[model samples]
Target: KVFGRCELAAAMKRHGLDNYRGYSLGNWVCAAKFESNFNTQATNRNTDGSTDYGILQINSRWWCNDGRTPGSRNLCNIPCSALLSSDITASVNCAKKIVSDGNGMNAWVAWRNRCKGTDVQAWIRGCRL
Candidate 1:
């Protein structure tokens, strides 16, 4: 596990996620909560045979190559295992790239389902961003 709510907010801000490409820290926090509950090593297998990895639940189909999957786009140019580590620098960098690719946070189903249009301020209530 990488963080609780407050810790995630602080770390995301430190990673310059407070307003990356016009998204908010709160939005990222909410997505993280629903995606992986801030677990750095979290992984989930989709029914489509693709897997989601790390705090962002980045997919093997479009982002990273887990080797177990074939024909991955590998847009992040990092291993899926790298995103599963405690050090999220690589993940953060990759996430930024993803956000810029026009999907923004909508690339994350969790953000679309749980964070979008919601008052997500509570995700960073006490965090000093």
Candidate 2:
């Protein structure tokens, strides 16, 4: 368990994610809602036998390495387990790096499939930033 939508907005703002590198808090929260509902320890196994880690559900295939997981590019240069911690610093930083790669939030399948092209303003609704 972690933050609700309101707290998540504040937390992301506190972490400078509101406009970090041009990404919006709306986009972040919307994607997160579908990703892990803000749960830091969230993990899901992909159909390809890879795993997703943390609130953003980063994949082991390209972002982080867990040593035991195969086909990891470790692009974020952090362990996959590190993303499961309660503290979101590593996850946020790694996600920033991911967006910096030029894909924006499209790096997340949840974002692409669910959040993209949708009116996501409700993601921050009533969350006083």
Candidate 3:
């Protein structure tokens, strides 16, 4: 399922992503935009054959378990398929763990490359709830 911008902002904000680790709600929203374009079923295969899953593109290398990545840590402990569902609770929880684990927003290179160093507030202007 594809999500509209403000709709995604609402979801991210409600799922404890607002100001998470000193990063704004807009930062999370912006990451989703670039990472998955708000596509709940988004998937990207890495150069190592590990796959990235869901809106935030949680990876098999260290996050979700695809049962295919050799020696994957599977830190998220959820099946990689779980991350592809439109219900984002799993992705949200894992994404939270990722940022909380120390990298903060930098867990996503998409965020650092596209959303960082900008006023991300523009991504959430009308997304109040």
Q: How accurate locally, in lDDT, is each candidate?
A: 0.87, 0.86, 0.91
Q: Tens-digit lDDT track for model 1 on 29-74? A: 9988899989999999987788999999998998898888766689
Model 3's alpha-carbon lDDT is 0.91
Candidate 3, residues 28-125: lDDT per residue as tens digits?
99999999999999999999999999999999999988889998888888999999898889999999899998878888999999999899999998
Residues 8-106, model 2: lDDT tens digits:
788777888887777678889988889998999999998887899998999988899977667668999999999988788888889888888887888
Worst 10 residues of 2 by lDDT: 66-75
- Kindly report which residue stretches of model 3 are placed more than 4 angstroms away from their true locations once superposed: none
The weakest ten consecutive residues by lDDT in model 1 span 1-10
Using TM-score as the measure, which candidate wins?
Answer: 3
Q: Lowest-scoring 10 consecutive residues by lDDT in candidate 3?
A: 120-129
* C-alpha RMSD values across all candidates: 1.1, 1.4, 0.9
Q: Which residue pairs overlap in candidate 1's backbone?
A: none
